[PDB]
Amino acid sequence: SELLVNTKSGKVMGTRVPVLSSHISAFLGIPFAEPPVGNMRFRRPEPKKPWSGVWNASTYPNNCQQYVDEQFPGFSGSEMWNPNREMSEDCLYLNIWVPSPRPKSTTVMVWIYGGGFYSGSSTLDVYNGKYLAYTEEVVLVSLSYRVGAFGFLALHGSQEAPGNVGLLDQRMALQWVHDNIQFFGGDPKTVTIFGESAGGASVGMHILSPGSRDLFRRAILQSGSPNCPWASVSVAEGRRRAVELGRNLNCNLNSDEELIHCLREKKPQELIDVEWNVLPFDSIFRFSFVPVIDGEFFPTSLESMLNSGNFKKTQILLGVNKDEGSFFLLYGAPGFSKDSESKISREDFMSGVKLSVPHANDLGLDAVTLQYTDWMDDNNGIKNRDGLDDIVGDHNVICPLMHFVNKYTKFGNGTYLYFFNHRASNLVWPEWMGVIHGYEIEFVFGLPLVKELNYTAEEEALSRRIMHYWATFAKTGNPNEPHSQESKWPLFTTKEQKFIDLNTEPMKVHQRLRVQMCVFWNQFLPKLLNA
Amino acid sequence: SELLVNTKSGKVMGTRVPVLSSHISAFLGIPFAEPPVGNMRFRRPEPKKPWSGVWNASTYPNNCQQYVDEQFPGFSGSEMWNPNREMSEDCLYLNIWVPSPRPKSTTVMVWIYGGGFYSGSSTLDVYNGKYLAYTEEVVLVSLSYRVGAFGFLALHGSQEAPGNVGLLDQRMALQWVHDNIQFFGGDPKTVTIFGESAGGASVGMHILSPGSRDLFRRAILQSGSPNCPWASVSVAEGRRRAVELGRNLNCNLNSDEELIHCLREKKPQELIDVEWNVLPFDSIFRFSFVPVIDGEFFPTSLESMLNSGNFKKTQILLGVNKDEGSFFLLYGAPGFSKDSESKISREDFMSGVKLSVPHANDLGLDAVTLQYTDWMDDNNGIKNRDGLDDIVGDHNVICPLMHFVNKYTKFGNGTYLYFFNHRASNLVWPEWMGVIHGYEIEFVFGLPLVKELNYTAEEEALSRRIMHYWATFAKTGNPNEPHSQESKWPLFTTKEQKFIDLNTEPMKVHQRLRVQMCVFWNQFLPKLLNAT
Ligand SMILES: COc1cc(CNC(=O)CCCCCCCCCNc2c3c(nc4cc(Cl)ccc24)C[C@H]2CC(C)C[C@@H]3C2)ccc1O
Ligand SMILES: COc1cc(CNC(=O)CCCCCCCCCNc2c3c(nc4cc(Cl)ccc24)C[C@H]2C[C@H](C)C[C@@H]3C2)ccc1O
Ligand SMILES: CC(=O)N[C@@H]1[C@@H](O)[C@H](O)[C@@H](CO)O[C@H]1O
Ligand SMILES: *[C@@H]1O[C@H](CO)[C@@H](O)[C@H](O)[C@H]1NC(C)=O
Ligand SMILES: *[C@@H]1O[C@H](CO)[C@@H](O)[C@H](O)[C@H]1NC(C)=O
Ligand SMILES: *[C@@H]1O[C@H](CO)[C@@H](O)[C@H](O)[C@H]1NC(C)=O
Ligand SMILES: *[C@@H]1O[C@H](CO)[C@@H](O)[C@H](O)[C@H]1NC(C)=O
Ligand SMILES: *[C@@H]1O[C@H](CO)[C@@H](O)[C@H](O)[C@H]1NC(C)=O
Ligand SMILES: [Cl-]
Ligand SMILES: [Cl-]
């Protein structure tokens, strides 16, 4: 009855789950596409064929095939991102958390996980939708999509491996929500898509892509935007990486059909094992198989679409964390360690900026170095460390997002910008890494409300305020309740460019997030590199 | 007797002048070269032919022909720099102040005036050597040299207008000091040359030039260095400007001989009236006729000479002022005024940096703008004004001098670096201009010791400390007195890069003078301009 729901594709049976001394309904692992296996590897998704009988939706689905991190085996801080379910190419499923009793027609939020387009699972403990659905009375969906080569191998001109199919997976799950969420008590006219990292880029990509725009109402982008330098490649570079993937696997490279046929006969892990070898440079914060600017999902360049206003005009809420770059330095740059303060020598600083800006010529490298070096104190290992941290986060996350937010706000219907700079009391990563890429997610999903996780009382308060901002924005297009007595998160406007800090202190309003460095990254350096 | 001196070129009769309730000897207007007039215009100087009888050295000489500033007529702050004597091409004279009684063999200091190589006079009130000669017991010489086209018109390959003749004027006066200062109580083996602005650049050029190195012992450079961007041109650019000067005056341009013959028939003011017209850009802090890198006075490029250590190895003392740029903005850039705080709009800021870096492409201007703009507060007229001020001073004075000091110290025998950041209490210019290009000179020459000039008691002490640093350095190669109990001015070293502030407060040591901006001007921007 409450757990038995008839959808347009067939019947589903959910499960009653406990949450904070109450219960809600969970529908886990609902299929929304045909399994993209066999000759359907690299292909656009096809809708799931209707099934007879009752789909048992009491269990999380498989996770998509992906590179599994083994840098710190058994360490909770890194394992919490790895697939916690069996991996399979049969992975196109979504999960729904529904308040109990079922609401009539309530706001829908659809989570798009991140992971650089190479990793990610809907089933991670930090993406458990039950705290947000219960506390804010929303229908919380989490979708999945093919990652890595399976989702973003791109041989433009081919219909067998066109590229962007992971974005099409997301779109087909949004289409499924549009057609079916009403049967779960959700309003298909009030769907907010939100995501972090590649999920945030994806959200912005659906804002841009005409074929996506009518499948959601408004959007939240966390630490990611569609114009990020890691988030797309040209059709020529996507083809080169695809060909290099076959070369790494002794494939016939004389035609698309032969290359594709060879790659389709490999086991998933054979592709994954060489995935990182197709990158053009030694780099950090670069991923092999990402969306392509193809002339179809994206009709023109992202920059020209942003300039012309050729995107969905709605409300957006978006923001960044204080130390986006630290995790990438830890994993990929010399002198960084999980178990030390990672003071960086000048020689390791210079190596880090070459890894961080891999496309830069020597003059561009000099420019980055000068912009981020204190020449009164150039051997200060802390300043070198934090300088490199800033380089990675500004270039890869903050300044791309600020470019997006400024272009979008020119045509949009309301922008809200945040700067998340709270370091969790119970963080397992060292202090030098600061406020890490991904670590606002646990506040967005209400994990500080779980007494056993040992967050402080004010972190619970911060999580509750963030969930209420996100949900109230989802319901209304404004994170504020306008008749409340609480401090108001102001609109971001072209002129005054206001944002708020998100942390445990009373609200502060600021202006021009990281404006100085983002002039460097968004205006000066591109002009230098194009000279 | 004390005033009657027999030099190698003839007898000279000086005069007894008052100085601070005492007296000393002054020999004013001694000729050291033949008058470079008529067909000797543009030529190298020739030694003054000996004279019979007694040369009357009681009176300042004429000043060389130069552009005269009329922006603020009668205003003391500008008039103090203009010629205070009749202008004439017959201007190659030097002045000497000797302590009384005449010392046996004391330290000599030779002042080389600045003025962008287009202007300047040995006779300005602020260059009066009597206070420094008296207070520090030194023989103080001030030379002169042709400026403008008369000193620096360069048609390389012509022996009639070869270029650099103003530098050769300075050398001829140094040669004269070498040969004759012993007759005035000076030691020709302990001569310190010092100068400000173009005079500081000149001092550096004599350090570089093989033909100058044996005519002095040590050097002081004030707000100028030989590698400054305004201080020299290539032989091609010098020839372009010489031809363009002829074009402005309807001259035959077919040959050097015909062009020079035309230019020698013009009256001095005719050349001066069009002098600024030959600059290749709208700019500030650029001057038309300047030293040329000719392969003769300078055997190779300045940078190669600095890199190879092909220069005189000795002790140097040098430094800069806090606000070198402000004077040039006042006279040449939109939005600046003597009579207001000169808050600068962003539109006038952008025009200013274009005028300040005339040789930069658009990417270069963008780089300058980014380095000096606070994009949290870009419509702040005060920040825009001070940012422009810093750009001008950093690009034209401070960073070129820091490049020189770092290159020199690698081979030299002792570097002392100062940063002069005191604003005179009686300053006549507005507060926004800060510590102006030229305004350390009055402290170097002891004017605060003159009660009628209304400096504070603290400023008199600063001047006496500066005079003592300068003269003690001249005597010994070290500004510090050995077993003194006062705080010590440390050697600038490649590694620690120490310098001192010069102001009324107790001396403080710092390191790496404007290092961040000078990485930009000395390394990044040149690499950007060369690459784009
Ligand atoms: C390319 O550079 C320019 C080109 C132009 C175009 N110029 C013209 O049309 C000619 C008119 C501008 C001529 C300006 C002459 C000013 C010389 C005044 N002498 C001073 C001097 C010094 N300091 C001064 C400080 C103040 Cl506040 C005021 C005057 C000072 C210190 C000196 C250095 C000098 C270069 C000149 C002289 C001695 C204008 C300005 C420029 O900067
Ligand atoms: C060919 O040259 C290259 C060769 C290589 C070689 N690369 C390799 O061998 C593999 C290195 C990739 C290691 C993958 C680690 C997975 C990170 C796990 N996910 C995290 C995630 C987030 N935050 C994390 C924060 C910390 Cl402190 C730790 C992990 C986080 C937030 C997310 C965004 C992500 C991109 C991944 C995931 C979700 C790399 C670069 C090159 O240029
Ligand atoms: C499961 C599997 O490997 N199927 C392959 C398919 O990928 C390929 O395109 C096709 C071409 O004939 O051959 C099949 O055997
Ligand atoms: C559905 O799956 C759950 C989890 O294993 C199980 O407890 C339940 O009995 C299943 N119901 C069926 C198969 O009808
Ligand atoms: C959003 O659009 C509505 C509808 O036209 C308009 O009235 C409102 O002013 C817009 N708000 C913003 C912040 O653009
Ligand atoms: C929280 O703290 C208690 C004691 O303070 C400890 O026993 C418990 O294991 C902690 N919880 C976690 C998840 O570490
Ligand atoms: C030298 O000249 C000055 C002024 O021109 C004059 O007063 C003085 O008498 C002259 N001396 C002699 C000896 O002629
Ligand atoms: C100057 O040279 C002398 C003689 O070689 C040497 O003893 C002295 O250390 C040098 N001083 C500096 C500061 O280089
Ligand atoms: Cl930190
Ligand atoms: Cl707006």
Facing residue for A531 by CB, picked from B376, B520, B532: B532
CA distances from B288 to A132, B152, B238 (A): 74, 9, 9
Residues of chain B in contact with residue A523, where contact means CB-CB under 8 angstroms, are 366
What's the rounded Cα separation, in Å, for the pair A37 and A91?
10
CB of B530 within 8 Å of any CB in chain A? Answer: no
User: What are the helix (H) ranges across A11-154?
Assistant: 76-79, 130-136, 148-152
What's the rounded Cα separation, in Å, for the pair B374 and B381?
11
Selection from B275, B291, B341, B314 nearest residue B66 by Cα: B275
- Tell me the Ramachandran region of residue B53: left when phi exceeds 0, alpha when psi lies from -120 to 50, beta otherwise: left
Q: What single-letter amino acid sits at A108?
A: V
Complete DSSP assignment for A486-529: SPP-PPB-TTT-EEEEESSSSP-EEESTTHHHHHIIIIIHHHHH
- Parallel, antiparallel, or unpaired: how do β-strands B292-293 and B93-98 relate? unpaired
Structure tokens at A368: 């980055």
Minimum-distance ligand 7 atom for the alpha carbon of B54:
13
Q: Dihedral of CA A176/A179/A184/A185: which sign?
A: positive
What's the rounded Cα separation, in Å, for the pair B151 and B268?
12
| B116 touches ligand 1 (CB under 6 Å) | yes
CB of B292 within 8 Å of any CB in chain A? Answer: no
CA angle A356, A359, A365 (to 5 degrees): 65
What's the rounded Cα separation, in Å, for the pair A371 and B13?
63
| B304 touches ligand 7 (CB under 6 Å) | no
Q: Dihedral of CA A520/A526/A527/A528: which sign?
A: positive
- Parallel, antiparallel, or unpaired: how do β-strands B106-112 and B22-31 relate? unpaired
Reported for B359-364, long-range contacts at CB under 8 A and 24+ positions apart, including other chains, are: B359/B229, B359/B281, B359/B529, B360/B525, B360/B529, B361/B529, B361/B532, B363/A527, B363/A528, B363/A531, B363/B528, B363/B532, B364/B525, B364/B528, B364/B529, B364/B532
Phi then psi dihedrals of residue A351, to 5 deg: -65, -40
CA distances from B321 to A469, B240, B393, B456 (A): 55, 33, 9, 20
Among A513, A519, A523, most B C-beta atoms within 10 A, so best to mutate, is A519
Facing residue for B516 by CB, picked from A376, A520, A531: A376
Residue nearest to atom 13 of ligand 7 (CA): B56
CB of A365 within 8 Å of any CB in chain B? Answer: no
Hey, which of A312, A315, A410, A413 would you mutate to test ligand 5's pocket, going by the most ligand atoms within 8 Å of its Cβ?
A: A413
User: What are the helix (H) ranges across A137-255?
Assistant: 148-152, 165-180, 198-208, 210-213, 235-247
Residues with CB under 5 A from ligand 10 (ion): A 493-494
Residues with CB under 5 A from ligand 9 (ion): A 434
- Other CB atoms within 10 Å distance of the CB of residue B478: 17
Residues in contact with ligand 4 by the CB-under-6-Å rule are A 56, 58-59
Strand runs labelled E in A246-340: 292-293, 316-321
DSSP B275: G
CB environment A402-423: b (16+ within 10 A), e (fewer):
bbbbbbbbeebebbbbbbbbbb
The experimental technique used to determine this model is X-ray
Facing residue for A376 by CB, picked from B363, B512, B532: B512
Specify whether the CB–CB gap between B377 and B307 falls below 8 A.
no
Contact A374/B531, CB-based, under 8 Å?
A: no
Structure tokens at A318: 């978006």
CA angle A293, A297, A299 (to 5 degrees): 70
Contact A516/B367, CB-based, under 8 Å?
A: no
Domain of A421? 1-531
CB of B519 within 8 Å of any CB in chain A? Answer: yes
CB of B375 within 8 Å of any CB in chain A? Answer: yes
Q: Is the peptide bond prior to A103 cis by the omega test (within 30 degrees of 0)?
A: no
Burial class (CB in 10 A: 0-12, 13-18, 19+), B451: exposed
Centroid of ligand 7 to alpha carbon of B41 (angstroms): 29
- Tell me the three state secondary structure of residue A414: coil
Resolution of the PDB structure in angstroms: 1.9
Specify whether the CB–CB gap between B464 and B135 falls below 8 A.
yes
Strand partners, B5: B12
Q: How many domains does chain B have?
A: 1
Selection from B345, B346, B437, B354 nearest residue B397 by Cα: B437
